[PDB]
Amino acid sequence: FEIPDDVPLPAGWEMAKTSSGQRYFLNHIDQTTTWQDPRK
Amino acid sequence: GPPPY
Numbered sequence: 001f002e003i004p005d006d007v008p009l010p011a012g013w014e015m016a017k018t019s020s021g022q023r024y025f026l027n028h029i030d031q032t033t034t035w036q037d038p039r040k
Numbered sequence: 041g042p043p044p045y
């Protein structure tokens with residue numbers, strides 16, 4: 001929840017789900033994974 | 041615990 005589509009994601013940043021909707025975002029420019037942050 | 045890539 002708390003994650004509308006008012007804005008897309010950041011460049012060089014893939015995404016992936018590791019659980020029940022755990023769409024953790026894959027930072028490409030830095031090669032890393034982080035929960036919600038860029039979207040919301 | 042951050043997930044892998």
Ligand SMILES: *CCCCCCCC
Nearest residue numbers: 033034035041042043
């Ligand atoms: C389930 C309690 C531990 C989860 C926090 C660890 C995040 C890496």
